[PDB]
Amino acid sequence: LPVGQWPVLTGGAVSLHSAGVTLSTQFTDFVSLNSLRFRFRLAVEEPHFKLTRTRLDRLYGLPAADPNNGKEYYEIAGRFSLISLVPSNDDYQTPIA
Amino acid sequence: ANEDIVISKTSLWKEMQYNRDITIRFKFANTIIKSGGLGYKWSEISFKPANYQYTYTRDGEEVTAHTTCSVNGMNDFSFNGGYLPTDFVVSKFEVIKENSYVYIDYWDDSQAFRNVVYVRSLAANLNSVMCTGGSYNFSLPVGQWPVLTGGAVSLHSAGVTLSTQFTDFVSLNSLRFRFRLAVEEPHFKLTRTRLDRLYGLPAADPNNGKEYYEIAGRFSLISLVPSNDDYQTPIANSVTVRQDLERQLGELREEFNALSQEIAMSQLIDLALLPLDMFSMFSGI
Amino acid sequence: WGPGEINDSTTVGPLLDGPYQPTTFNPPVDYWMLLAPTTPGVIVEGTNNTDRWLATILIEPNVQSENRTYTIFGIQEQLTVSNTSQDQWKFIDVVKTTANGSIGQYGPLLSSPKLYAVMKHNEKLYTYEGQTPNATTAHYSTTNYDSVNMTAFCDFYIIPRSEESKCTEYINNGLANEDIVISKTSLWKEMQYNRDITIRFKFANTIIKSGGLGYKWSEISFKPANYQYTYTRDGEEVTAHTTCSVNGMNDFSFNGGYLPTDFVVSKFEVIKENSYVYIDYWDDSQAFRNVVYVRSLAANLNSVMCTGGSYNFSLPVGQWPVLTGGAVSLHSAGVTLSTQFTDFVSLNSLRFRFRLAVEEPHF
Amino acid sequence: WGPGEINDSTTVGPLLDGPYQPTTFNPPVDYWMLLAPTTPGVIVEGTN
């Protein structure tokens, strides 16, 4: 703000829980990747987000101001299970791709 | 004239009085400016706008406050022990007296303080404090240095005056708390000059080397603050409501089996003959 | 609405027009000339060139009759100097009937603090005579009193006639942490206005003169000036109440001589580029009733071509100096809408600030 | 939230060395004694 007190968008938490998984295709500047898309449903939590020096107080959700909150990354650890079909014409020679 | 237009729709405001303990630390300053000549004369020995910054433990949380102090309404006396260049002619010694009021501007970074805009009323339960005058030597190319001795003055709280300078579309705030000055013992003597036992803090040394003039007092500020109450939010603004746990399936099955008592054979046969379909089965559920 | 609390530049007037060094300067009618020495010798010589050659002369305490030669009125002659007091200095008046004839002495004057006063009234010179604290104001009858040239050899002061008591005194002994809700939520609305209003104002001056002749101008600053007028703004008679002041102006001092009739000007204020004029208007109209909780404010006041004052410095005798020149324009410098909450009532003061730009001619 | 103005006035021609009256004194270092004479006669007599 050029003059006066600086408004601040502080707060706002959400929780991510798994809600299925499906195939997708990421891309890079040189190659395309056969990625897996994990879809997570959201759930707002106790930390509220306010807009100081205003009248928007006690709002819930995660705004887009600084969703990372200074963290380098958010981590979700778990397990996935897939059964892929491989074209094997013999009792052996199971292809590895 | 004959014109006026609407800017915005109506808004929700409320009146609220903020009561806060304020500590006041303001050190005076002296110009003490030497006029031309051999060095005996003085242009205008007067108080200057003295600025400082502090941090106080108010309400259990540190508050950072800028502090400007000045005085207006002082009496300006003159001295003439001879107009000769080797003699002592002082144009104006500024002295605080009953005609003098101290004006002090405060800038605290606290919440209510920032909220003090478009205010309704202010009450200041400040404490009167004694301010004494020190001594200083007036430079002279020849002769002993003249000095000050004694004196004191007392500050008494008076009306607070808040101002807002309007530039373009910005309001620059300017608070000014006022203190009436009442002179008190001891008295002021200037060496090698006429004044003997004069009263009133001079423009030479009102600080007296004091750390700061600590005045502790409460302040009640009734101002029209803006607020929407707990409204103007989304109709579903709250933490996610956890769905209630359903039931233990074992006991659910137990109760379902127990329901077999309330079954009539003939009516059950009729219901069995009726072909339940995707509609009939779930219509009344 | 109405109040104004900007008042600075206090002044003190020299009670006796300050000290004066040895020279030929006389006391005008209704003005005592007081004399304060440093060391003995000659004090004053009042010469009419016609019939009066008075001379007030110092003598130390405990001094007997001694014959000494003095260069009085350019001629060396022998005179007798004597004292009667043992602790009080003597101020003896030598009287010369004629230049050729002998010269006498009278007017023994016993006072410790070394202060003594002379005057001219009612066909008589009023010279302090006698012993302290009863030192009288004895009188000598002669002609052409106002023409007496008073050539003196000490420090001096000038007093009014009404302060004979002061002259006698001088001769006899010398000089918490919580918040609460007041009222529930209410309805408000920022409201715009497009209105033009005429503005007119006057000035005033603190003309503080020194005590005595008047050739010593202690100070001339600006006064807080209050006025009232009526204006027709779009068919609505408004009683505008006006209060003026000025701050941050540049000042001058002048000295044509450090002596009584010499034109001395200790301090004079003058509006200049650095100067700003604080101007308060009060109107009972709806706009100025609604201007309490104001969000924004902008004034488009046009320039004001201002010509400086021109009056003749009042002095008791002699040519009158005058001031002419130095025009000034005024430009908007913002508006301060201050509120002053005393213990019970709120004095709401609106002050437009006007920067003063300076322009020819030259003062 | 910045401080407001304070009523003040600048110095009143302080650096004006006026008509120092004629008598016996000792000129100090770095003070040129400009003169204002009017009629024929002696102006200054500096005696060591």
PDB file of C-alpha atoms in Angstrom, chain C residues 13-229:
ATOM      1  CA  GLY C  13       8.515  45.564  25.429  1.00  0.00           C
ATOM      2  CA  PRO C  14      11.537  47.281  26.980  1.00  0.00           C
ATOM      3  CA  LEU C  15      10.017  48.976  30.007  1.00  0.00           C
ATOM      4  CA  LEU C  16      12.478  51.894  29.853  1.00  0.00           C
ATOM      5  CA  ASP C  17      13.469  51.549  26.170  1.00  0.00           C
ATOM      6  CA  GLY C  18      16.606  49.682  27.218  1.00  0.00           C
ATOM      7  CA  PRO C  19      20.023  51.126  28.022  1.00  0.00           C
ATOM      8  CA  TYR C  20      21.521  54.149  26.302  1.00  0.00           C
ATOM      9  CA  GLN C  21      25.198  55.015  25.947  1.00  0.00           C
ATOM     10  CA  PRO C  22      26.800  58.458  26.382  1.00  0.00           C
ATOM     11  CA  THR C  23      25.464  61.000  23.882  1.00  0.00           C
ATOM     12  CA  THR C  24      23.451  64.219  23.423  1.00  0.00           C
ATOM     13  CA  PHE C  25      19.848  63.025  23.758  1.00  0.00           C
ATOM     14  CA  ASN C  26      17.148  64.810  25.730  1.00  0.00           C
ATOM     15  CA  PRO C  27      14.033  63.842  27.710  1.00  0.00           C
ATOM     16  CA  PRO C  28      10.824  64.920  25.953  1.00  0.00           C
ATOM     17  CA  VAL C  29       7.794  66.125  27.871  1.00  0.00           C
ATOM     18  CA  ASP C  30       6.253  63.432  30.095  1.00  0.00           C
ATOM     19  CA  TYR C  31       9.410  61.267  29.899  1.00  0.00           C
ATOM     20  CA  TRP C  32      11.897  60.974  32.757  1.00  0.00           C
ATOM     21  CA  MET C  33      15.545  60.484  31.851  1.00  0.00           C
ATOM     22  CA  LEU C  34      17.172  58.092  34.332  1.00  0.00           C
ATOM     23  CA  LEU C  35      20.949  57.884  34.686  1.00  0.00           C
ATOM     24  CA  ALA C  36      23.004  54.933  35.954  1.00  0.00           C
ATOM     25  CA  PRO C  37      26.814  55.287  36.142  1.00  0.00           C
ATOM     26  CA  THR C  38      29.711  52.842  36.324  1.00  0.00           C
ATOM     27  CA  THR C  39      32.455  55.044  37.814  1.00  0.00           C
ATOM     28  CA  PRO C  40      32.350  58.609  39.176  1.00  0.00           C
ATOM     29  CA  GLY C  41      32.973  61.750  37.133  1.00  0.00           C
ATOM     30  CA  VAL C  42      30.545  63.804  35.054  1.00  0.00           C
ATOM     31  CA  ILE C  43      27.051  62.387  34.537  1.00  0.00           C
ATOM     32  CA  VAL C  44      25.049  64.816  32.396  1.00  0.00           C
ATOM     33  CA  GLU C  45      25.093  68.374  31.084  1.00  0.00           C
ATOM     34  CA  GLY C  46      21.814  70.088  30.269  1.00  0.00           C
ATOM     35  CA  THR C  47      22.586  73.096  28.076  1.00  0.00           C
ATOM     36  CA  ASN C  48      20.057  75.519  26.611  1.00  0.00           C
ATOM     37  CA  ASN C  49      22.724  77.836  25.100  1.00  0.00           C
ATOM     38  CA  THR C  50      20.618  80.745  26.458  1.00  0.00           C
ATOM     39  CA  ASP C  51      20.290  80.716  30.280  1.00  0.00           C
ATOM     40  CA  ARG C  52      20.849  77.136  31.516  1.00  0.00           C
ATOM     41  CA  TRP C  53      24.105  75.184  31.801  1.00  0.00           C
ATOM     42  CA  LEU C  54      23.197  72.580  34.413  1.00  0.00           C
ATOM     43  CA  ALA C  55      25.588  69.690  35.015  1.00  0.00           C
ATOM     44  CA  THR C  56      24.847  66.604  37.107  1.00  0.00           C
ATOM     45  CA  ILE C  57      28.178  65.241  38.370  1.00  0.00           C
ATOM     46  CA  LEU C  58      29.075  62.070  40.278  1.00  0.00           C
ATOM     47  CA  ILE C  59      30.807  61.963  43.653  1.00  0.00           C
ATOM     48  CA  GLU C  60      31.844  58.921  45.668  1.00  0.00           C
ATOM     49  CA  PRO C  61      30.691  58.424  49.269  1.00  0.00           C
ATOM     50  CA  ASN C  62      32.860  59.838  52.055  1.00  0.00           C
ATOM     51  CA  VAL C  63      34.260  62.671  49.934  1.00  0.00           C
ATOM     52  CA  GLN C  64      35.222  66.037  51.410  1.00  0.00           C
ATOM     53  CA  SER C  65      35.494  69.445  49.745  1.00  0.00           C
ATOM     54  CA  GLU C  66      37.978  69.221  46.866  1.00  0.00           C
ATOM     55  CA  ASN C  67      38.651  71.767  44.115  1.00  0.00           C
ATOM     56  CA  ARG C  68      39.038  70.214  40.662  1.00  0.00           C
ATOM     57  CA  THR C  69      39.156  71.404  37.055  1.00  0.00           C
ATOM     58  CA  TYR C  70      36.574  70.016  34.624  1.00  0.00           C
ATOM     59  CA  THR C  71      36.125  70.475  30.871  1.00  0.00           C
ATOM     60  CA  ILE C  72      32.512  71.599  31.197  1.00  0.00           C
ATOM     61  CA  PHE C  73      30.981  73.093  28.037  1.00  0.00           C
ATOM     62  CA  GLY C  74      34.411  73.343  26.427  1.00  0.00           C
ATOM     63  CA  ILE C  75      35.946  75.618  29.091  1.00  0.00           C
ATOM     64  CA  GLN C  76      38.138  74.435  31.967  1.00  0.00           C
ATOM     65  CA  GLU C  77      37.249  75.958  35.335  1.00  0.00           C
ATOM     66  CA  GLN C  78      37.634  75.036  38.996  1.00  0.00           C
ATOM     67  CA  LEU C  79      34.651  73.648  40.907  1.00  0.00           C
ATOM     68  CA  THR C  80      34.143  72.275  44.411  1.00  0.00           C
ATOM     69  CA  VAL C  81      33.102  68.650  44.950  1.00  0.00           C
ATOM     70  CA  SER C  82      31.968  67.504  48.395  1.00  0.00           C
ATOM     71  CA  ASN C  83      29.815  64.822  50.013  1.00  0.00           C
ATOM     72  CA  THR C  84      27.908  64.483  53.281  1.00  0.00           C
ATOM     73  CA  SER C  85      26.772  60.850  53.199  1.00  0.00           C
ATOM     74  CA  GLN C  86      29.189  58.084  54.153  1.00  0.00           C
ATOM     75  CA  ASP C  87      27.642  55.325  52.007  1.00  0.00           C
ATOM     76  CA  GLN C  88      25.435  57.152  49.462  1.00  0.00           C
ATOM     77  CA  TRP C  89      26.837  58.529  46.211  1.00  0.00           C
ATOM     78  CA  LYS C  90      26.270  62.199  45.380  1.00  0.00           C
ATOM     79  CA  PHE C  91      24.771  63.602  42.165  1.00  0.00           C
ATOM     80  CA  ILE C  92      25.503  67.336  42.430  1.00  0.00           C
ATOM     81  CA  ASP C  93      23.967  69.866  40.025  1.00  0.00           C
ATOM     82  CA  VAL C  94      26.407  72.571  38.931  1.00  0.00           C
ATOM     83  CA  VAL C  95      24.548  75.725  37.854  1.00  0.00           C
ATOM     84  CA  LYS C  96      26.072  78.471  35.693  1.00  0.00           C
ATOM     85  CA  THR C  97      24.305  81.830  35.689  1.00  0.00           C
ATOM     86  CA  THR C  98      26.556  83.105  32.888  1.00  0.00           C
ATOM     87  CA  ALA C  99      29.619  81.971  30.968  1.00  0.00           C
ATOM     88  CA  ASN C 100      31.735  84.882  32.219  1.00  0.00           C
ATOM     89  CA  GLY C 101      30.468  84.781  35.798  1.00  0.00           C
ATOM     90  CA  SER C 102      31.311  82.227  38.450  1.00  0.00           C
ATOM     91  CA  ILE C 103      29.523  78.886  38.800  1.00  0.00           C
ATOM     92  CA  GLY C 104      27.682  77.445  41.796  1.00  0.00           C
ATOM     93  CA  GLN C 105      26.564  74.020  42.962  1.00  0.00           C
ATOM     94  CA  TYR C 106      23.371  72.665  44.512  1.00  0.00           C
ATOM     95  CA  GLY C 107      21.173  69.584  44.490  1.00  0.00           C
ATOM     96  CA  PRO C 108      23.105  67.155  46.686  1.00  0.00           C
ATOM     97  CA  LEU C 109      21.759  63.694  45.873  1.00  0.00           C
ATOM     98  CA  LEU C 110      22.494  60.818  48.261  1.00  0.00           C
ATOM     99  CA  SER C 111      21.550  57.400  46.859  1.00  0.00           C
ATOM    100  CA  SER C 112      23.432  54.109  47.115  1.00  0.00           C
ATOM    101  CA  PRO C 113      22.209  52.411  43.894  1.00  0.00           C
ATOM    102  CA  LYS C 114      23.525  55.154  41.562  1.00  0.00           C
ATOM    103  CA  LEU C 115      20.278  56.016  39.757  1.00  0.00           C
ATOM    104  CA  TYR C 116      18.841  59.487  39.240  1.00  0.00           C
ATOM    105  CA  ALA C 117      16.158  61.128  37.125  1.00  0.00           C
ATOM    106  CA  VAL C 118      15.487  64.430  35.353  1.00  0.00           C
ATOM    107  CA  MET C 119      12.355  65.870  33.738  1.00  0.00           C
ATOM    108  CA  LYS C 120      10.820  69.034  32.286  1.00  0.00           C
ATOM    109  CA  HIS C 121       7.325  70.172  33.303  1.00  0.00           C
ATOM    110  CA  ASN C 122       5.197  73.137  34.320  1.00  0.00           C
ATOM    111  CA  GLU C 123       7.772  75.856  33.664  1.00  0.00           C
ATOM    112  CA  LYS C 124      10.391  74.008  35.734  1.00  0.00           C
ATOM    113  CA  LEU C 125      13.117  71.414  35.409  1.00  0.00           C
ATOM    114  CA  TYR C 126      12.203  68.470  37.660  1.00  0.00           C
ATOM    115  CA  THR C 127      15.512  67.124  38.975  1.00  0.00           C
ATOM    116  CA  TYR C 128      15.467  64.495  41.689  1.00  0.00           C
ATOM    117  CA  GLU C 129      16.786  66.080  44.886  1.00  0.00           C
ATOM    118  CA  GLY C 130      17.185  64.949  48.481  1.00  0.00           C
ATOM    119  CA  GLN C 131      18.288  61.804  50.281  1.00  0.00           C
ATOM    120  CA  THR C 132      16.900  58.307  49.889  1.00  0.00           C
ATOM    121  CA  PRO C 133      14.320  56.966  50.489  1.00  0.00           C
ATOM    122  CA  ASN C 134      12.792  60.470  50.597  1.00  0.00           C
ATOM    123  CA  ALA C 135      14.676  61.787  47.551  1.00  0.00           C
ATOM    124  CA  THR C 136      12.358  64.474  46.203  1.00  0.00           C
ATOM    125  CA  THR C 137      11.682  65.833  42.697  1.00  0.00           C
ATOM    126  CA  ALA C 138      12.873  69.384  43.258  1.00  0.00           C
ATOM    127  CA  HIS C 139      12.216  72.063  40.663  1.00  0.00           C
ATOM    128  CA  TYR C 140      14.234  74.846  39.040  1.00  0.00           C
ATOM    129  CA  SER C 141      12.496  77.718  37.245  1.00  0.00           C
ATOM    130  CA  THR C 142      13.944  78.831  33.894  1.00  0.00           C
ATOM    131  CA  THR C 143      12.924  79.167  30.225  1.00  0.00           C
ATOM    132  CA  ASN C 144      13.101  76.994  27.092  1.00  0.00           C
ATOM    133  CA  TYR C 145      13.133  73.624  28.830  1.00  0.00           C
ATOM    134  CA  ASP C 146      12.392  71.423  25.815  1.00  0.00           C
ATOM    135  CA  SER C 147      15.406  72.880  23.982  1.00  0.00           C
ATOM    136  CA  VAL C 148      17.807  71.621  26.675  1.00  0.00           C
ATOM    137  CA  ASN C 149      20.402  69.439  24.984  1.00  0.00           C
ATOM    138  CA  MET C 150      21.273  66.641  27.421  1.00  0.00           C
ATOM    139  CA  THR C 151      24.835  65.403  26.829  1.00  0.00           C
ATOM    140  CA  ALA C 152      25.545  62.608  29.303  1.00  0.00           C
ATOM    141  CA  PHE C 153      28.376  60.228  30.166  1.00  0.00           C
ATOM    142  CA  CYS C 154      26.853  57.040  31.629  1.00  0.00           C
ATOM    143  CA  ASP C 155      24.158  54.449  30.973  1.00  0.00           C
ATOM    144  CA  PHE C 156      20.587  55.717  30.791  1.00  0.00           C
ATOM    145  CA  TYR C 157      16.924  54.775  30.642  1.00  0.00           C
ATOM    146  CA  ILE C 158      13.653  56.529  29.801  1.00  0.00           C
ATOM    147  CA  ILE C 159      10.489  56.322  31.908  1.00  0.00           C
ATOM    148  CA  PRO C 160       6.958  57.725  31.596  1.00  0.00           C
ATOM    149  CA  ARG C 161       5.804  60.566  33.822  1.00  0.00           C
ATOM    150  CA  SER C 162       3.150  58.401  35.491  1.00  0.00           C
ATOM    151  CA  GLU C 163       5.929  56.176  36.904  1.00  0.00           C
ATOM    152  CA  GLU C 164       7.426  58.685  39.346  1.00  0.00           C
ATOM    153  CA  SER C 165       6.921  55.944  41.939  1.00  0.00           C
ATOM    154  CA  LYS C 166       9.125  53.623  39.879  1.00  0.00           C
ATOM    155  CA  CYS C 167      11.722  56.382  39.544  1.00  0.00           C
ATOM    156  CA  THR C 168      11.719  56.872  43.321  1.00  0.00           C
ATOM    157  CA  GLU C 169      12.074  53.123  43.873  1.00  0.00           C
ATOM    158  CA  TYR C 170      14.979  52.934  41.419  1.00  0.00           C
ATOM    159  CA  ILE C 171      16.745  55.845  43.110  1.00  0.00           C
ATOM    160  CA  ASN C 172      16.128  54.549  46.639  1.00  0.00           C
ATOM    161  CA  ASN C 173      17.087  50.890  46.111  1.00  0.00           C
ATOM    162  CA  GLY C 174      18.095  50.523  42.461  1.00  0.00           C
ATOM    163  CA  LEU C 175      16.333  48.320  39.937  1.00  0.00           C
ATOM    164  CA  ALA C 176      -6.261   0.577  31.076  1.00  0.00           C
ATOM    165  CA  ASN C 177      -5.838  -2.350  28.651  1.00  0.00           C
ATOM    166  CA  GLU C 178      -9.444  -3.246  27.762  1.00  0.00           C
ATOM    167  CA  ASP C 179     -12.299  -2.186  25.487  1.00  0.00           C
ATOM    168  CA  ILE C 180     -16.090  -2.003  25.771  1.00  0.00           C
ATOM    169  CA  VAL C 181     -18.958  -1.502  23.313  1.00  0.00           C
ATOM    170  CA  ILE C 182     -21.074   1.658  23.450  1.00  0.00           C
ATOM    171  CA  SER C 183     -23.823   1.370  20.835  1.00  0.00           C
ATOM    172  CA  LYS C 184     -24.909  -1.371  18.466  1.00  0.00           C
ATOM    173  CA  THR C 185     -24.196  -1.354  14.744  1.00  0.00           C
ATOM    174  CA  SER C 186     -25.584   1.656  12.882  1.00  0.00           C
ATOM    175  CA  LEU C 187     -26.094   2.817   9.303  1.00  0.00           C
ATOM    176  CA  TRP C 188     -23.709   5.332   7.729  1.00  0.00           C
ATOM    177  CA  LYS C 189     -22.848   6.461   4.215  1.00  0.00           C
ATOM    178  CA  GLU C 190     -19.979   8.369   2.638  1.00  0.00           C
ATOM    179  CA  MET C 191     -21.508  11.403   0.925  1.00  0.00           C
ATOM    180  CA  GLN C 192     -19.968  13.483  -1.861  1.00  0.00           C
ATOM    181  CA  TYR C 193     -20.422  17.211  -2.402  1.00  0.00           C
ATOM    182  CA  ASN C 194     -19.820  19.512  -5.383  1.00  0.00           C
ATOM    183  CA  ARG C 195     -20.238  23.032  -4.023  1.00  0.00           C
ATOM    184  CA  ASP C 196     -18.338  26.298  -4.414  1.00  0.00           C
ATOM    185  CA  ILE C 197     -18.214  28.835  -1.586  1.00  0.00           C
ATOM    186  CA  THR C 198     -16.900  32.390  -1.467  1.00  0.00           C
ATOM    187  CA  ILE C 199     -14.146  33.165   1.037  1.00  0.00           C
ATOM    188  CA  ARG C 200     -13.038  36.526   2.445  1.00  0.00           C
ATOM    189  CA  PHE C 201     -10.719  37.442   5.298  1.00  0.00           C
ATOM    190  CA  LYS C 202      -8.918  40.258   7.109  1.00  0.00           C
ATOM    191  CA  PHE C 203      -5.651  40.526   9.071  1.00  0.00           C
ATOM    192  CA  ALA C 204      -4.445  41.960  12.378  1.00  0.00           C
ATOM    193  CA  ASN C 205      -1.168  42.963  14.017  1.00  0.00           C
ATOM    194  CA  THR C 206       0.296  42.895  17.519  1.00  0.00           C
ATOM    195  CA  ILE C 207       1.928  46.343  17.516  1.00  0.00           C
ATOM    196  CA  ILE C 208       3.939  46.259  20.756  1.00  0.00           C
ATOM    197  CA  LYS C 209       5.969  49.448  21.192  1.00  0.00           C
ATOM    198  CA  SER C 210       8.736  49.977  23.716  1.00  0.00           C
ATOM    199  CA  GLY C 211       8.052  51.970  26.867  1.00  0.00           C
ATOM    200  CA  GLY C 212       9.294  55.525  26.433  1.00  0.00           C
ATOM    201  CA  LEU C 213       9.959  57.713  23.402  1.00  0.00           C
ATOM    202  CA  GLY C 214       8.710  55.301  20.733  1.00  0.00           C
ATOM    203  CA  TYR C 215      11.765  55.313  18.460  1.00  0.00           C
ATOM    204  CA  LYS C 216      12.363  51.795  19.826  1.00  0.00           C
ATOM    205  CA  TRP C 217       9.870  49.431  18.188  1.00  0.00           C
ATOM    206  CA  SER C 218       9.881  46.337  20.379  1.00  0.00           C
ATOM    207  CA  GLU C 219       7.857  44.137  18.034  1.00  0.00           C
ATOM    208  CA  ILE C 220       5.168  44.114  15.378  1.00  0.00           C
ATOM    209  CA  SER C 221       3.784  40.621  14.749  1.00  0.00           C
ATOM    210  CA  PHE C 222       0.473  39.316  13.391  1.00  0.00           C
ATOM    211  CA  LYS C 223      -2.655  39.191  15.575  1.00  0.00           C
ATOM    212  CA  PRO C 224      -5.406  36.555  15.546  1.00  0.00           C
ATOM    213  CA  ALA C 225      -8.204  38.409  13.765  1.00  0.00           C
ATOM    214  CA  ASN C 226     -11.887  37.472  14.092  1.00  0.00           C
ATOM    215  CA  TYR C 227     -14.709  38.682  11.836  1.00  0.00           C
ATOM    216  CA  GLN C 228     -18.169  37.780  10.538  1.00  0.00           C
ATOM    217  CA  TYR C 229     -19.866  38.309   7.177  1.00  0.00           C
TER     218      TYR C 229
END
